[PDB]
Amino acid sequence: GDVVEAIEGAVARVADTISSGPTNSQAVPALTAVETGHTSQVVPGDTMQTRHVKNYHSRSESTIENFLSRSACVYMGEYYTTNTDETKRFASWTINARRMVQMRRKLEMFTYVRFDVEVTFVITSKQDQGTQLGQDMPPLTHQIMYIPPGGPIPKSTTDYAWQTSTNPSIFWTEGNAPPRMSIPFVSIGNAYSNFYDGWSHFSQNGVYGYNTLNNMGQLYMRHVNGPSPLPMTSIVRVYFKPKHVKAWVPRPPRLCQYKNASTVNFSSTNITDKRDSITHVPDTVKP
Amino acid sequence: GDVVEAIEGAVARVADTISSGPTNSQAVPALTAVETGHTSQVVPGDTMQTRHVKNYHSRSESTIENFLSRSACVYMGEYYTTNTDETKRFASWTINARRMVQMRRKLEMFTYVRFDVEVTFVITSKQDQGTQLGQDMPPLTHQIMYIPPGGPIPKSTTDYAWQTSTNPSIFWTEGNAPPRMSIPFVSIGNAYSNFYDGWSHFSQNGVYGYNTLNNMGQLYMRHVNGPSPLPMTSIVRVYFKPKHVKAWVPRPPRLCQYKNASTVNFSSTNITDKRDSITHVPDTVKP
Amino acid sequence: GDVVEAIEGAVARVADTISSGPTNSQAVPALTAVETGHTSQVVPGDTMQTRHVKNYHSRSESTIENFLSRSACVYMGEYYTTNTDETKRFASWTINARRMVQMRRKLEMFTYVRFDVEVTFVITSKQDQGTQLGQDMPPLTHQIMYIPPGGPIPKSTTDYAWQTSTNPSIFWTEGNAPPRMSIPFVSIGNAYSNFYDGWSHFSQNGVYGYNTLNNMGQLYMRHVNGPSPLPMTSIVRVYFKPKHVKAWVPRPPRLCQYKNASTVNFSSTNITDKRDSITHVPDTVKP
Amino acid sequence: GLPVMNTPGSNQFLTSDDFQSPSAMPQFDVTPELDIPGEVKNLMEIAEVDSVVPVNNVVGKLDTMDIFRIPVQSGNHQSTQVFGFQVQPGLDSVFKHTLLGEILNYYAHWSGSVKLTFVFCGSAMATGKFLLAYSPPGANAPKTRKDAMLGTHVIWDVGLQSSCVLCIPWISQTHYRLVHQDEYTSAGNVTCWYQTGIVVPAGTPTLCSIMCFVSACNDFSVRLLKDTPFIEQSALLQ
Amino acid sequence: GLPVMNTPGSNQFLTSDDFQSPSAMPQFDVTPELDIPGEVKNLMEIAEVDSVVPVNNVVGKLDTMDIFRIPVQSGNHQSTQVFGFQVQPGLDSVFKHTLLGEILNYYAHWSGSVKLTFVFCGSAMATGKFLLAYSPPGANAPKTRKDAMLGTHVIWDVGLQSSCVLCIPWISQTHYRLVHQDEYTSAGNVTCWYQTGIVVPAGTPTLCSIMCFVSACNDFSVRLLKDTPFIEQSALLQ
Amino acid sequence: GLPVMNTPGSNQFLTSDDFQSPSAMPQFDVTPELDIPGEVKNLMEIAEVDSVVPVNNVVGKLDTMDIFRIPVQSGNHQSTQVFGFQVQPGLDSVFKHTLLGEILNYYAHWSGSVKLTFVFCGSAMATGKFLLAYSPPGANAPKTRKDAMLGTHVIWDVGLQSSCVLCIPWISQTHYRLVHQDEYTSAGNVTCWYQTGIVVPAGTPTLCSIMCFVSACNDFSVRLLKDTPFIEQSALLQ
Amino acid sequence: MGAQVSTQKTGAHETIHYTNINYYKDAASNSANRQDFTQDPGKFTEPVKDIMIKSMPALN
Amino acid sequence: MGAQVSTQKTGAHETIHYTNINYYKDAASNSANRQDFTQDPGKFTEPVKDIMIKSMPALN
Amino acid sequence: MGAQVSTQKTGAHETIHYTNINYYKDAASNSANRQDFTQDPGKFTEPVKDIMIKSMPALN
């Protein structure tokens, strides 16, 4: 265990099919009571005769780790390299996984989650359209600064805040692998809250919901080369991959379409899609 | 220790109160010399008679981990889903914890810090105001790309840089839990520097301060659905939670108001607030 | 090993120089065949007489960890604190390390990489120029929300998506250390891909390249104080530091200049720089 | 300088990969763990829980609670089918939005048996027997109770136990079926018929309802993570 | 598919939580650790260090170094109080900006004794005795030295040891006081009086100063992390 | 409240530091590891691999494959040098863009021997001998073969083994040289001369080529990470 | 080195290990725990006192 | 499994453990070390050679 | 505490340890593995079956 430490294979199959013959008894597994809030633990061997089937299937891809540990876009932000307006040459983002809908819906399948993140950036520049497009610009380097809540916010691309003496920053020049770094679980509580039924103020007013507990800081992005002779746009895409995941209190998957990121507001949604009648099963065997 | 490994409770109480009777001696604990740069280690039992008090208080919430491991907003960035200007449809951010003031002030209480981060994003869309607001848009998915320094910066929302073959990216659709991923300690030095008394150039000029050592890259955020029929805005908030924290060389807390993120520039600030006189203690026992 | 566990020094020197005298034999180490795709393992002792040199040099700074574990800017993004347009008051970024050129080129030296990230933000505010600049604004707090793919995208700075009930967020106030959090390896595959030779659609069309596999989400950044009486700009720089790095299939370093972040498009580049002739070695010993 | 050669896949960002990264926050002290009730370790623990099936997903009822109740009544109605649907637990509009169906639409492949529990919600004085018949694929859905009773059926007798379980076993030619099911990976149909009427006394409501709960058995499993076709957006900030 | 049930608090982002996440940078080789001098492991190690108290925080002096010096002089001045303040180590404008006060304003609750060291900065030839009196709450601040000497006092004699320590003990009805202190969690007051004059020879300055240093004792502790009311901003990039 | 004192370097962001951080994704289950072929653990494993040197980097050829071939021919040409360059493996336009040169331009210091393999690419019927001469610094580049043969040389005889290795040993006054090399850390030059002609039969091409491969030996090492002067950009999104 | 040697995800019926070394100092920087397969569906199914036998009528 | 069993933050005077398993491969991805309570106020207080006794006058 | 005691990067010829404690619960949050110096240049150099002797002609 000094140089090498083995690890036993945690392999977990699904349950087998046990063989069941004919029955005539006072045992009634198909008869239960949903009124108890209890899901019936009936297997197929109770309601019909079954052969023995040795099952080798596994539930490894429905584990919470394997279900959530996928990189997913959380933000897409544009910023220019030259522009008369200065707040256009850099990008801000208040960190939250609520603006891209897929990862938000995946995370909101649980009430509480606790995990580390792997943040990857996909930065991509393009030359804006114009009368002249000929130029020779060296590779674009980008700075992504993580400003935790309370630190100084930059006002330009030449601000002192970009000195990043303590804030963590990534410098990355175009043409290389995407930048990627890890983030521990950085909540002030014992888990992140996808939902906060409550208020910010004890007077039961102010802000309602996710935003009161949600303050992880912001991300600022700029070019370091300075302005180009001709306008160029960099789009930075942010990808979160949670790892070492733990989840509590699963919720029914969001049925309605998300409206904004501040709230859970929704338009009223049908339960499902209509069919022709209650007995409608369309014929599939026909000439 | 193969299946389960116990861990002994590191519980740390504060010091007790030892009982002290009356004294008349040549020992003088209340008499010291601040000229030595030494803080007196006097307890209350030296300057008065004390009962024995068994103390059960703990300093667990002033530990550096417990003081810093809170998610804090570092960036808040807007980006549109449709706009004639292209650099508005995505957001950039140069990563640094210096633009939101609270987390910046918390981190700058130490000269050097080394930690992993947990980056959570809180993305929130809203429908812009206009003459027509009726539409049926599917859930908004967001890409947050982490571009380390040197990688290609995007120029549009359709740039090749968003291919994120190597840059880490998170795709997240609205309605789900916030995106969250971990980031290791990714400095090129042995710790992050909140303060850099020095220059970028050996000629003792160029950039002064935090920005020379601060290059962690940038974050880019975009929508993946493409443009909506009607304008919508996504705000991405970035939350950093440091974990596995180590801190060196504590500093006096920032007294003045932060001015920008590039520097430590400040307006001159009073030491404290005024009162009526040097002996002024207002009466609280009165009819 | 309960309180303290020692760790043996992994020190790795380069190979020594073995002493070689004169030779006359049928051994021919200087004669080989590059046609085999095999690099000659010749040392200097084969082609000339060598003393014994005990070498103490190490390759510790060319290790993949030590080569990549540097914070590098990946995004730089501006966002305003007050503006008539709302999508300007926050910043978005689609996470990818492809928009700043240096870190992108560093990462694209390998085909596959797997690492955790340390995301640091460097947020820096500045006061915009105008007729009146006198005001007294309290410290600027920033929210950086990480929205994994699918979560709700914000539309304003007051959106419900900023509730960050589940998305990880960092709140950081200006004046403090930069915000920094860790992110685990959050890919859905077994490693990140800097390059994806392939398509999104099985019909061999759609999107080509890095963007199909790249969805880590987005970062959103905003100010929490609300609008200032006078305009101010925060720039957030994002810095990625990969740690616990593993790399596979090294590639020839990018020779051409990066053009955008979506693609690997390039202008045709000379192999190297010209000199005067094939025998040209300029004299350095002359009066 | 150790000699080394870069392989294809270098500097690519594969969204599924699993590598170590550097932490942006070194030595960050993470909050202690709290024993919260209800920790999920596998989505199959979720899909194993009942959820009311909207079997009455006919027009004018998709936004009402009447979408959940299968109507039964007293009288000679045996010539009529109570209900019937296809066992497409992730494609059928009767199942795609149940808990099991939602979990299914995140994967491409499913396998295993599926429980349908049926609950009678009439008076304690009303009595009735039903035939619940699952028919494997390869023939059309039965048109009569005589045809339905040739498949796998349960004859449910209503009593003090108010619910019956019809377990749809895994009878497939393949180990997995597609969640986006086509005619190759078809799974059959479920129908219900009156076995022995509904008999009710006087002063009792003659028309009652039945509820359907779907859940996955213990041999159920999924494969090939994908994105749901359910949530979609047109722009960010949403 | 293991059966599983989601509990309240799922898909919420609690800013204080502590869960494992996936690393965006797998197998990232982190820089080696360096033994830097002065590692902080607890903020109480910081608050245990002296800091000059601005006791002379009267108008016209808030931006000068004269805010730190308590003025003493020679003559019959015993009818006058040298200084006095409330022991509100995180609310009082005399303490809110000291090291201890700054650390305090990040928490809601504080507990323990607080040292006030006093330093004489006159000539070596000047001599004087002072009474430093901490009075617990429940009465008004003393108006005379006769009233102040009924509380916890030290009679400081100035000599070659230039500083005295007045330890304010924890005499509270509760285990903790509020940092934002109100009349319930009041802590008393500290006053100073001339015990025996200030006597100085000729050719020596007759008016000298005293400095105050505040620090937390070893039984001091804090509770209930909060945000400071000190740093505020109007916009980003700051 | 443990007493504690903050040292310089607090709240600075040093881009090279190595500290623990909090994970933004607690308990995130990371994808399992896959044994991918070709794992790199040191960039010196990369720089130890041959790469074709562009020795013919003369005008009009920088964008063609003719930049790689050193032209040799038959006839009395011994009065002419085949080629010559400076051993500046990270500064010389002949080496800065090779694999070794690229890896070098990420560091400031290099050390060790460098292999130059030469490959003959004429007919199997063509024969020739060459002198490959590395000359240490301190004199000018040789002008004759008589001068070149006083340095470290190999007399390469072309046969069924088509390639020769000229190892440039570490002969330096310092342990390291600068990658951005100046006259102090100069490393010498490499030249080639015809030793014994090129003799070819009839019906055979009389002019052939030679290729140069550069790699780092096993004692090679680098120091002082820096940024390449190669990739540069004018703006983001690139 | 401090290598871990675990088992790769193979098949269960058809006719091997992988090595891991942690390079970074923080645990937030490791790779995902892709192979942790413990289960407990009883929190959500059968979340009742008075356990139900599945053969007994379940009422009366 | 490789479970750790530590003690929960309880009270100190009033009249229990929690389990942790690390799922991810990188240590940057673990949860915060919320319970590390070692201390050393002597770096900042009493940072002097010639230790001071607190009973002796401290000068002369 | 669970301290690790490793060796600092010193010189190799001129005439010491550092302590580490992991505070956070996730391994993604540790510090970089700055000191892992194993090597294998043979994947890229000499990636051939029929190993070459370096003394033998290497052909024929």
Numbering used by the authors:
A (entry chain A), B (entry chain A), C (entry chain A): 1 to 287
D (entry chain C), E (entry chain C), F (entry chain C): 1 to 238
G (entry chain D), H (entry chain D), I (entry chain D): 1 to 15, 25 to 69
Pull verbatim passages from the article behind this deposition.
Echoviruses, for which there are currently no approved vaccines or drugs, are responsible for a range of human diseases, for example echovirus 11 (E11) is a major cause of serious neonatal morbidity and mortality. Decay-accelerating factor (DAF, also known as CD55) is an attachment receptor for E11. The capsid consists of 60 identical protomers arranged with icosahedral symmetry and each protomer is composed of four capsid proteins, VP1–4, derived from the P1 polyprotein. DAF is one of the regulators of the complement system, inhibiting formation of the complement convertases in both the classical and alternative pathways.
